Amino acid sequence: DPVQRYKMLIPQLKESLQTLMKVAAQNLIQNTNIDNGQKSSDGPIQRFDKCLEEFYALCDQLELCLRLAHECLSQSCDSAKHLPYPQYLAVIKAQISCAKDIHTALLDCANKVTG
Amino acid sequence: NTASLCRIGQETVQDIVYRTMEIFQLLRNMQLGTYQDRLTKLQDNLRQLSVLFRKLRLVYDKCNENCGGMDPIPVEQLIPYVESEERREIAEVNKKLKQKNQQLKQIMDQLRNLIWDINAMLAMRN
Amino acid sequence: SGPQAFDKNEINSLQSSEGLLEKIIKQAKHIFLRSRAAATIDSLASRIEDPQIQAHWSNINDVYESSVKVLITSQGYEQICKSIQLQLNIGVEQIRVVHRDGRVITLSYQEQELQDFLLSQMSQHQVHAVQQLAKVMGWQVLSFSNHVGLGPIESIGNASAITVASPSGDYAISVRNGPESGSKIMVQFPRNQCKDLPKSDVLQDNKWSHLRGPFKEVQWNKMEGRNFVYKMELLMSALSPCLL
Amino acid sequence: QYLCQPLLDAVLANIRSPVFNHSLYRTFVPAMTAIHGPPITSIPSVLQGEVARLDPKFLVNLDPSHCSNNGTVHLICKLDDKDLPSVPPLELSVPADYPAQSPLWIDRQWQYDANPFLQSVHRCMTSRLLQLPDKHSVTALLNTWAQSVHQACLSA
Amino acid sequence: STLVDELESSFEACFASLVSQDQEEIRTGVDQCIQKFLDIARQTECFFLQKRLQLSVQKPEQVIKEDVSELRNELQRKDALVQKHLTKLRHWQQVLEDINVQ
Amino acid sequence: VSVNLEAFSQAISAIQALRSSVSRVFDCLKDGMRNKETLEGREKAFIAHFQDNLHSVNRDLNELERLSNLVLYSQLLQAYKWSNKLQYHAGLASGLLNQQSLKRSANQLVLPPQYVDDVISRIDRMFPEMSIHLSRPNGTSAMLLVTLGKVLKVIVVMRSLFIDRTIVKGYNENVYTEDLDIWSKSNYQVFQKVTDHATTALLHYQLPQMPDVVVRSFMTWLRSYIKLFQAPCQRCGKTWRDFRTLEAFHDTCRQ
Amino acid sequence: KNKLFIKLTRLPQYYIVVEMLEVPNKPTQLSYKYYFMSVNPAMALLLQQFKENMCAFNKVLAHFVAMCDTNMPFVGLRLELSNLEIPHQGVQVEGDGFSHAIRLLKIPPCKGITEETQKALDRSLLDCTFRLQGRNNRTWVAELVFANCPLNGTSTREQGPSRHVYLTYENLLSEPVGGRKVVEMFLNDWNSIARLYECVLEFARSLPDIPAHLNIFSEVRVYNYRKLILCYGTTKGSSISIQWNSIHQKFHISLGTVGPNSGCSNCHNTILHQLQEMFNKTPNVVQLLQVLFDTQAPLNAINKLPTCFSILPQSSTHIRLAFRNMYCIDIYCRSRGVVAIRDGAYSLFDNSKLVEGFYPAPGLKTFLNMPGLVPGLAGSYLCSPLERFLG
């Protein structure tokens, strides 16, 4: 699904870049033709601004999908790294809490000795 | 007196960094009984480290407050460029240690000869 | 060996063909060589006392071989001054030296060779001591040459060379020790500090008056401490920032 | 090339138009500033260094005697060392644009004659300048002068 | 001002990252704190060495007392080592005298 | 898998690069040409910068397409993150601080044979290619026969949990297998040079107090001698393995 | 026919030839002649003879061998310096007798650096002494000594106007000691030093006129001529580092936390890429200090959110937050301590929903925490802290 979505958006991102480049070229040519002496049709034109925001929207959607997948994969690998299941989670949380107590003790002592 | 307190201050500042290094190594080896031992070791290290701070501080105060009469010459004016009964006690101790070192050298020579002989015999017996 | 097709000399040749006299003579020669090396190192230990000398003979020996472990440290700085160590192999007729830097040298039964080699190794350990001390006191090494070729043509051992700079810029020290002519140390004082250098009218700015200049020499005699490293550390502290 | 080309073509059309920027400016100002928001919140130094980094044997100085300060920089330096101080001036004319036109020593045979040692030092130092590589520096001339004097000492 | 205080603050700062309530950040942080701690430690060592040099060049008697104490300690250590060696030698002498028999 | 994690992390940067590169093309165009002191220079500078910006957009887009192919409860995650952070931080700190040690002096054997046997067995457990045979023919001083493939047969001579002498021999050569041939030579010059380099490594790997990491590093350095007659010298035409960098080198070339 | 060929293993292709000749008057003595040979089926190139200057050591032989082994590596470096049009003095004996050094006079000025900065650099380079050290004699060190340092640091670097930087280069085992890569890397480091001196000169010129908040907010800490470590924060905890990577030809900033009061990170690690690009487009450090001072306070609040909420880093001062995937919100930081929040999924143009969609219904919660999606603003950094948990 996260890999699948990344595949789905990539053709769209290429399409959005193509339109944004083409629309920019049409707008610049019309503006240069109006600024210099050169007749040009009013036409549909299509606004450059609308295309540039669309490209940014697709970029955010892709980054959000990848960031979630990376976070989910990192959490899974860490979970594997660390008889009944309730006692299992109990001893895990106990080890983590005792490590945190050691942390707090070292911190408070090293901060009370000086500074 | 003061020249030895300065050496004490030197050894304290040379040992505090080693103590911090040992503390870093202990925190590194602490992966998640043995936890109690690691904790009490870290606490003892911290206490001895604070004691070392206090010792280096007090020896600093001592060497700073001493400032004996014979210090009018600033640094770089002291380096030599091109252009009683204490000595008798030193000589006596030197003669004594020289005799003891000669005797110890004789003992070491005899021990080396013994070991070489035993090794040669136990090697040739095969 | 004949069934498994052994080589001409390899695993055959004579296939044990010596005499009692030959073996006994070889053993006697090895014993004499061992004794000689031992006495030489002992003298070196008693006569030369400045850097150090150490020897740890191996537990198990043979009738035609032995081994020692020579170390050349300093009197006070045993930890840091651990750059030169030797492992002699006293054979029946040759003494093989394996240095810590990957250098193998086949010496001779004659003592002068071993004595000169140990003297050159002490001379090199002397400059390695200054190098390891500059590494610890935070002094920046500017140059280091293990076998320098500029200066007077030296004795049995080639001269060594080091030049370090003070952490706070201006000051700098240089050391050249050798087996014949050694302990040639000279400090590099900064300009505008000696006040004896001839000024020049071409220098019209004050920015150039901060470079390390007149290269004043220091007498290693009539100094403090007891070992080369003690005096080097005292000189480094003298050229340090006065935090008194 | 791919997917960008018409933009490329467009700007390659419209260079050397005087009104150019403005057209670009107009069609590209609002959207960007809407999306990203508001905008942002005497003597040359090389000779001086070469002098400062000489060996204390030399005591180089300027030359106010001859016609100078119009062409090259003339120097009478010295020879001060355990060696010999024969003829200290060795007038050297360092031309402008130092990293080229290697400086030339103005020869003065009037003083180097009438003495065998001075004739020998002149001969050997001249030969050593002949063997010197092209585009030599001032320090090179000073060092070859010193070593030529030393060769004359060891020869006689 | 009291370089002891500054070295204490640097030793606290070397712990100021973990003791609080990716890899490049911790990397550069440990680089900076460790290098600062090393520089200030080498500076305090330099100050101590300067004080030692001054006291030795102007008061060369406490150093002599130190040499006396060190030599006496060396002699005592040598005596203790030779005593232990003699004990081991006598033990092995008795052991060997026990054997060799028939 | 870890390879997937890296591909996702690389891809996240590639999306950020594509967005930044597209913004750069438009942002630079808005500023337009600059004077540049010359007509030719100004035209060239604008074209060069625009073309570089246009190319960067193409390169960044291509990477994203290629990268597609490759790929009470919160407190627990906080503890996991802090554990990883402390591990990395303490590792880096211990490395940086033991690399530069200010210790200058120390002043301010007997060992159980079963302990040495356990250490040797632990070392033999790793490095499955190497096989170490423990034996004590003469006293408590142990003698280790270490077989490395069909390549080497090293004879380490322990006096304690300490390495004293090493004599490597060839695989086809005979160590005599019995009362051990401690004193002999390999009869081949290559193995003699390897014995010299092994004694050099022994003199190099010398930790003061801990007697186990020295043997660990010695066995690791010996294991590097498995691809002999198969590896280049890296500065020579086709016997030494540098320390801290297990790279082959000829003794005549350097190192 | 009685000669010895002593090859130099460290520097190849150089062979010393020691020939022995019988002396006529003494039938029990020999004479030695030493020649310096060189090789390119071995082909000799040139031959020159040095003739000037227990009894088995032959002192002069070892002396000549050591002299050759120490001097010959400098010849290749001199040739490489001459081949790249770098004016350099010849190999000179240093003042401490034993040595060799190649002191450069002028460096090729630069590429891509303004003329006035080139002048400021060329008038501050006092010496560029190169020296040789290291085992096997293949490590080079160049000591550059600059004068008139623009700005000092908190460390003990406020001494006399002479800053000494040591640049070390160790070529590979092959590619012999005298090669092109050493001087190429040296020129690359010089170019990076110049491109950094640009920014340090700009900052030194802008130091007298400061908006008076960044002066207490930020402080310079070290200046090693290749890195800029500025430190900011209320307690001077956070640190930013500026450096020019010649490999990528772009400025590389590295952020860290050095101070005994801070969070778990620099708190700016979520905007690192946009800050990289921002400093790459316009190399000005005062703008960096300003944007950091403006964006630190909202970042301290937006970093503590539970990680549900997802932080999408958009362009600078436009950090995006998204509860789950359905909801979104835009954070527009501005000067004078204000943040403008938006509807998120809403579009700034024709009213259509984005790919995420799911228009956030309430909206007015942001108004009470002081269509209908235009602009919610005026939060004075305290709403930015409470509205986090509230929303």
Short mmCIF file of C-alpha atoms in Angstrom, two decimals, chain D residues 34-38 40-41 45-47 49-50 53-56 97-100 133 135 137 139-140 143 150 154, chain G residues 87 89-90 92-95 103-106 122-123 126-129 282 287 290-291 294 315-318 332 348:
data_model
loop_
_atom_site.label_atom_id
_atom_site.label_comp_id
_atom_site.label_asym_id
_atom_site.label_seq_id
_atom_site.Cartn_x
_atom_site.Cartn_y
_atom_site.Cartn_z
CA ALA D 34 1.60 33.56 -2.71
CA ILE D 35 2.91 30.07 -2.12
CA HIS D 36 6.29 30.53 -0.50
CA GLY D 37 5.18 33.78 1.05
CA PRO D 38 7.00 37.04 1.62
CA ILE D 40 13.85 37.15 2.64
CA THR D 41 14.04 38.13 6.30
CA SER D 45 53.19 41.94 -0.85
CA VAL D 46 54.91 38.85 -2.29
CA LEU D 47 58.33 40.50 -1.93
CA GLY D 49 56.49 37.96 2.50
CA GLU D 50 59.62 36.56 0.86
CA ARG D 53 60.51 34.50 5.58
CA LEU D 54 64.26 34.71 4.96
CA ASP D 55 66.99 33.09 7.02
CA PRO D 56 68.41 35.51 9.64
CA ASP D 97 54.96 41.17 -11.63
CA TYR D 98 57.17 38.90 -9.50
CA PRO D 99 55.73 35.50 -10.57
CA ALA D 100 57.49 36.02 -13.92
CA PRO D 133 66.35 26.78 -13.44
CA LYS D 135 61.92 31.66 -13.28
CA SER D 137 63.21 33.34 -6.97
CA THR D 139 65.63 33.13 -2.06
CA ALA D 140 67.15 30.89 -4.74
CA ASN D 143 70.97 30.41 -1.26
CA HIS D 150 80.96 27.99 0.93
CA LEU D 154 86.16 24.55 0.96
CA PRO G 87 54.78 30.36 -7.99
CA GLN G 89 60.25 29.01 -3.83
CA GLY G 90 62.75 26.22 -4.35
CA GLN G 92 65.26 25.43 1.00
CA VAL G 93 67.04 24.35 4.16
CA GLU G 94 64.89 25.51 7.06
CA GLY G 95 66.27 27.60 9.90
CA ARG G 103 57.17 27.99 0.86
CA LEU G 104 54.59 29.25 -1.62
CA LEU G 105 54.51 32.94 -2.56
CA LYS G 106 51.11 33.38 -4.26
CA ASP G 122 45.78 37.81 -0.73
CA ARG G 123 46.77 40.61 1.67
CA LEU G 126 51.48 35.44 5.25
CA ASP G 127 52.99 32.00 4.64
CA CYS G 128 52.05 28.69 3.00
CA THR G 129 54.92 26.49 4.21
CA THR G 282 21.59 33.54 -0.74
CA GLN G 287 19.21 36.08 7.51
CA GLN G 290 16.88 36.01 11.93
CA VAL G 291 14.89 33.06 10.58
CA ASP G 294 11.79 33.66 14.40
CA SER G 315 9.31 25.32 2.39
CA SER G 316 10.84 27.45 5.15
CA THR G 317 8.36 29.01 7.60
CA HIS G 318 5.67 26.74 6.11
CA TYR G 332 2.98 30.26 8.57
CA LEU G 348 -6.05 28.48 -1.77
#
